[model samples]
Target: MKVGQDKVVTIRYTLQVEGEVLDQGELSYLHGHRNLIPGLEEALEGREEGEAFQAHVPAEKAYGPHDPEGVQVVPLSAFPEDAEVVPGAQFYAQDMEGNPMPLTVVAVEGEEVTVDFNHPLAGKDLDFQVEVVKVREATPEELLHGHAHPS
Candidate 1:
């Protein structure tokens, strides 16, 4: 079956940035939900079960362009005592509304830690080499849960 809304699509892809392959894995998801990157999802819109696709997903269509203002410098005290304050570390944070927002460590000076609230892939284009492994009708329960399920 062709990949479309409510279908279960399984794919193997190598995700790259700046010529480096950072993630090479397989994922299966409900086709119409926001389960995959916007660009990847859109790219698979009408592809059939065995298609191969290679595309450069732009920054805007991926994690979004990096935002300088999203990088905030705050006193180390704002974080839990056990949190690491070093570059490349990640932590979970809450928004003003108490929602789970992800945070990344950018830099650590003497008394302050710089946390980047942007996604890890933010401000960068993504390179994807994809192989569509399977496409089939999604079970009713899978559609209800908005996810892929074992057949």
Candidate 2:
């Protein structure tokens, strides 16, 4: 069967950036539900189980082009007294709507912290070798829940 909406699709993929293997894992998702990366999901459309292919997603179709503007310098007062704002540290903050926003520390000055809100993979090409393992009808519960259900 073809990968289509409401289908429970299972795949094993090896993700690489440059020549280095970044990740390799099995994933199952409800097709057309925005579960996978937009570019990867689009490339898998019309594929059948047992098919394998390579997809190269450009930055524009991947996490998106990096925006230097997404970096901000926040006052130390904005963080807790005991909070360590060292480089590479990550924390979750609330946005204006109270949604969880991920923030990564880029630099820590005396009274300020430089944070970047862009995704780590932003502005990079993604290479994927995907093998579709299964494709089956999604249960009503899975479709209603907007996700895949465990078999």
Candidate 3:
């Protein structure tokens, strides 16, 4: 089977950013359903198992550009005293709609903490080397859940 709508596609991929191999793994997901990034979906289209290719996904197609407004400076006291609010720490807050939003600590001062709301991968171009491992028609349950399930 080919990678297409209603197909459960499995792939082995390596992600490189700035020549660094940041991530490499195997993944299985329903195709043509936006489960993977747009660029990757497009690249894997029409491919059969064992097909290998390299793709460049620009920032616009990947995580998009970083927004300056997403950076916020909040008082250190806003967080729990027991929590470590040091640089590189991550926390989550709920939006008015009750959706979770990730907050990354960028810097810390005496009383102020700089947190970034941008996705960690935002603004970075992604390079991927992928090999199609398997392709099969998604099962009824997989379609119902809108995602692939472990076999």
Tens-digit lDDT track for model 3 on 1-151?
7789989999999999988999999999999778999989999999988999999999899999999898999987787667876888888887769888898998988777899889988889999999999999999999999999997
Candidate 1: RMSD to truth: 1.9
Better of 1 and 3 by lDDT: 3
TM-score of 3: 0.89
Q: What lDDT tens digits, residue by residue, belong to model 2 across residues 83-129?
A: 68689888888788877769889998887779988887777899999
Query: How far does residue 128 in candidate 2 sit from its true spot (Å)?
Result: 0.9
Worst 10 residues of 1 by lDDT: 77-86
Off by over 4 Å in 1: 80-83
lDDT (0-100) at residue 44 of candidate 2? 91
Candidates ranked, most accurate by TM-score first = 3, 1, 2
Worst 10 residues of 2 by lDDT: 76-85
Instruction: Let me know the TM-score candidate 1 reaches against the reference structure.
Output: 0.87
lDDT, candidate 1, 1-151, per-residue tens: 7889988999999988998889999888999989988998999999988999898899999889998888988898887577677899988887888878788989999787788988898999998999899998888899889899877
